[PDB]
């Protein structure tokens, strides 16, 4: 696409915000807010349209996980309701396969899941598949040839360097190689043939390091850390450069984006978002 759009998040409170970011200009645009605030939601585009999944409503009136899907239209800057999952998804972890939406894990109360459902856009409905091996939330979620990957996460008591491999016309879930560290809330992407997982927490303290996962080899291997720990932040990829977006350090709410170079192996801070963030949802499509 063109855009790096990034929706709701948490800061004192989930946000409602639509923001989008032009890295050939470097401008930002505030776009129609989210009809309910919402943080440690997934976003993703699907036709040019995007998606935002799940999340939880962190409010003074109370606190209320969502099973919402909402889709967002670039040529008119309109929200509208789709429909919802069969349970409420906080901390989810969602991707494309075939124009399908998965959406992974999360939480609802205390329940930690580990059941997987499926979005047809062109029938507008949700349909379960095989559930992953292990509740995550906080899970990392990509795809790489047109299979899906489930990295680190929450299973209510441990958190996980643990990840997992779906293979759609086998509906099975299988263990691949561990990271070498314990990230939940990290961000995953995919970059060439590598699955790459960035920041997030392993207990104790918020990551900046960052490994990527080599299909073919099966192992993890570090790349250049990040110049800000964080966890909870937003990923995505733009012409072959991974964005990080925000997060929390645990010291502050970040603004901080930051720009990862696979030829150099550097990052670069490249823009601040309005105001300082966790959890938010980000995807890339067209301008509006
Ligand atoms: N570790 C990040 C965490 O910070 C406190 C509030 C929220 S909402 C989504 C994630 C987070």
């Given at each position: 696409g063109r855009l790096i759009y990034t929706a709701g998040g948490y800061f004192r409170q989930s946000l409602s915000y639509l923001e989008a970011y032009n890295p050939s200009n470097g401008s930002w645009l505030r776009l129609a807010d989210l009809q309910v605030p919402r943080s440690g939601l997934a976003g993703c585009v699907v036709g040019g349209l995007l998606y935002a999944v799940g999340g939880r409503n962190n409010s003074p009136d109370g606190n209320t996980d969502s099973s919402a899907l909402d889709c967002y239209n670039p040529m008119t800057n309109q929200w509208s309701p789709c429909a919802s999952m069969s349970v409420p998804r906080n901390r989810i972890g969602?991707?494309?396969?075939?124009?399908?939406?998965?959406?992974?894990?999360?939480?609802?109360?205390?329940?930690?899941?580990?059941?997987?459902?499926?979005?047809?856009?062109?029938?507008?409905?949700?349909?379960?598949?095989?559930?992953?091996?292990?509740?995550?939330?906080?899970?990392g979620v990509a795809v790489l040839n047109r299979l899906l990957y489930?990295?680190?996460?929450?299973?209510?008591?441990?958190?996980?360097?643990?990840?997992?491999?779906?293979?759609?016309?086998?509906?099975?879930?299988?263990?691949?190689?561990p990271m070498n560290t314990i990230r939940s809330g990290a961000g995953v992407?995919?970059?060439?043939?590598?699955?790459?997982?960035?920041?997030?927490?392993?207990?104790?303290?918020?990551?900046?390091?960052?490994?990527?996962?080599?299909?073919?080899?099966?192992?993890?291997?570090?790349?250049?850390?990040?110049?800000?720990?964080?966890?909870?932040?937003?990923?995505?990829?733009?012409?072959?450069?991974?964005?990080?977006?925000?997060?929390?350090?645990?010291?502050?709410?970040?603004?901080?984006?930051?720009?990862?170079?696979?030829?150099?192996?550097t990052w670069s801070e490249v823009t601040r978002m309005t105001s300082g963030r966790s959890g938010v949802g980000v995807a890339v499509t067209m301008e509006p």
């Amino acid at each position: 696409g063109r855009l790096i759009y990034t929706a709701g998040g948490y800061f004192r409170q989930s946000l409602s915000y639509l923001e989008a970011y032009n890295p050939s200009n470097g401008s930002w645009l505030r776009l129609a807010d989210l009809q309910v605030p919402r943080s440690g939601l997934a976003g993703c585009v699907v036709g040019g349209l995007l998606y935002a999944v799940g999340g939880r409503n962190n409010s003074p009136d109370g606190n209320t996980d969502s099973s919402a899907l909402d889709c967002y239209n670039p040529m008119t800057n309109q929200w509208s309701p789709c429909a919802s999952m069969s349970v409420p998804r906080n901390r989810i972890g969602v991707g494309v396969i075939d124009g399908h939406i998965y959406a992974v894990g999360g939480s609802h109360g205390c329940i930690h899941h580990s059941s997987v459902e499926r979005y047809e856009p062109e029938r507008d409905e949700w349909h379960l598949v095989a559930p992953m091996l292990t509740r995550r939330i906080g899970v990392g979620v990509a795809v790489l040839n047109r299979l899906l990957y489930a990295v680190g996460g929450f299973d209510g008591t441990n958190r996980l360097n643990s990840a997992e491999c779906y293979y759609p016309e086998r509906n099975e879930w299988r263990m691949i190689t561990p990271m070498n560290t314990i990230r939940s809330g990290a961000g995953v992407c995919v970059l060439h043939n590598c699955i790459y997982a960035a920041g997030g927490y392993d207990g104790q303290d918020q990551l900046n390091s960052v490994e990527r996962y080599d299909v073919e080899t099966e192992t993890w291997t570090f790349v250049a850390p990040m110049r800000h720990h964080r966890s909870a932040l937003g990923i995505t990829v733009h012409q072959g450069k991974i964005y990080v977006l925000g997060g929390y350090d645990g010291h502050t709410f970040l603004d901080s984006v930051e720009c990862y170079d696979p030829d150099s192996d550097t990052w670069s801070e490249v823009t601040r978002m309005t105001s300082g963030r966790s959890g938010v949802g980000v995807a890339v499509t067209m301008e509006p």
